[PDB]
């Protein structure tokens, strides 16, 4: 009935100290604790994952070596460049303790979902989407998503894998691309030379997972209602043809106006009806976050999101709290989309649709 929220201090101060998103993890839960939602959510306080767990996605050459790096630094292991340890990703220390936090909290909100402690599970520090089984990628050094998506897989026979950040949720398609067990579908930006270069709709999966990996290549400046429309044409098919168990969805919110990346033209309220729409579902649910790079603009909207899986309407004005003063100038919730304008013609983004429709007819008809 009441969903789970995975946290403890420890766990958010580990995740405060990743680099790029400095006490992202800290605004985000102050803004949620200012608004009084931890009150009607059951708090856990997540496990670390332990060797054996990592292992069941990623090799043990890999855990090994991130292992090592951590505790050292870069300057006397050149064998770092191998397993993705680049600009990209740095090899700073403590990076396994922080791995291993994340992955364990989407391990146990993935295990309250098997208890039938709940239907929605939250743990909004994970959603690294990128890592690979022997690869850091993307400041991913480890796929929590996947870890969480195996974990269920014990109750749930099959798995809806859905991925709202801006990125394409590469990862996570590449290691289920050879199974029907999950299906995977992204929706993000797809450009020359725009990060990680793949997930175009012809993105279909291999072997046994043909048709079992969706894709939704969109260009910049989609706002609300035209992303929605995208998205809950192509769930509505995808829940048809494949029937899922139980959902884990990526939240990222480095789609949203404002963001450093700054291409959609997102706000809150958009991404909250996607979400309002997999939640009637009424199946169980992992919500995990990813990528935020306005860190302001990634707790509103983390916080509002929060919000639509209780039920609650919350208040314009921000709370007073910890970090109040970033939320300046306007002191507000809501997020304005920026005066850009939207490059996505209707044309093709009906023969996306289209395309995306008859390939989920393979997964009907091949039944
Ligand atoms: C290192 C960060 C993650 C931070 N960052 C900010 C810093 C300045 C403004 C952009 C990036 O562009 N990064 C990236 C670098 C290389 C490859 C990918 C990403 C983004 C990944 C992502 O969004 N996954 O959902
Ligand atoms: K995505
Ligand atoms: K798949
Ligand atoms: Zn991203």
Same mark, same amino acid.
């Given at each position: 009935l009441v969903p789970v929220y995975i946290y403890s201090p420890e766990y958010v101060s580990m995740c405060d100290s990743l680099a790029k998103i400095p006490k992202r993890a800290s605004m985000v839960h102050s803004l949620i604790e200012a608004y009084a939602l931890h009150k009607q959510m059951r708090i856990v306080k997540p496990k670390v994952a332990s060797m054996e767990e990592m292992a069941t996605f990623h090799t043990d050459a890999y855990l090994q070596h991130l292992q090592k790096v951590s505790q050292? &630094? @870069? $300057? @006397?292991? *050149? $064998? !770092?460049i191998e397993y993705g340890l680049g600009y990209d990703c740095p090899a700073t220390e403590g990076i396994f303790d922080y791995a291993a936090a994340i992955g364990g909290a989407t391990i146990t909100a993935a295990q309250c979902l098997i208890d039938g402690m709940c239907k929605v599970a939250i743990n909004? !520090? =994970? &959603?690294?989407?990128? /890592?690979?089984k022997d690869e850091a990628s993307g400041f991913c050094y480890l796929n929590d998503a996947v870890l969480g998506i195996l974990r269920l897989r014990r109750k749930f026979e099959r798995i809806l894998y859905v991925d709202l950040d801006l990125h394409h949720g590469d990862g996570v398609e590449d290691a289920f691309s050879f199974t029907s067990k999950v299906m995977t579908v992204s929706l993000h930006k797809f450009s *020359? =030379?725009?990060?990680? =270069?793949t997930g175009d709709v012809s993105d279909v999966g291999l072997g046994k997972g043909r048709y079992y990996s969706v894709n939704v290549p969109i260009q910049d400046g989609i706002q609300d209602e035209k992303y929605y429309q995208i998205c809950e044409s192509v769930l509505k098919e995808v829940y048809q043809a494949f029937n899922p168990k139980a959902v884990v969805l990526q939240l990222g919110? $480095?789609?949203? /106006? =404002?963001? *450093?990346?700054?291409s959609f033209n997102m706000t809150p309220v958009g991404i909250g009806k996607c979400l309002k729409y997999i939640l009637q579902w009424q199946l169980a649910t992992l919500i995990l976050g990813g990528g935020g790079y306005n860190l302001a603009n990634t707790a509103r909207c983390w916080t509002y999101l929060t919000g639509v899986i209780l039920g609650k309407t919350l208040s314009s004005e921000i709370p007073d709290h910890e970090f109040f003063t970033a939320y300046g100038p306007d002191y507000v919730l809501e997020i304005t989309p920026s005066c850009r304008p939207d490059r996505n013609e209707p044309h093709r983004i009906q023969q996306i649709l289209n395309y995306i429709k008859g390939n989920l007819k393979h997964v009907v008809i091949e039944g």
């Open positions: 050292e &630094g @870069d $300057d @006397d292991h *050149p $064998d !770092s909004w !520090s =994970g &959603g690294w989407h990128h /890592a690979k *020359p =030379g725009f990060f990680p =270069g919110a $480095d789609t949203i /106006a =404002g963001d *450093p990346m700054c």
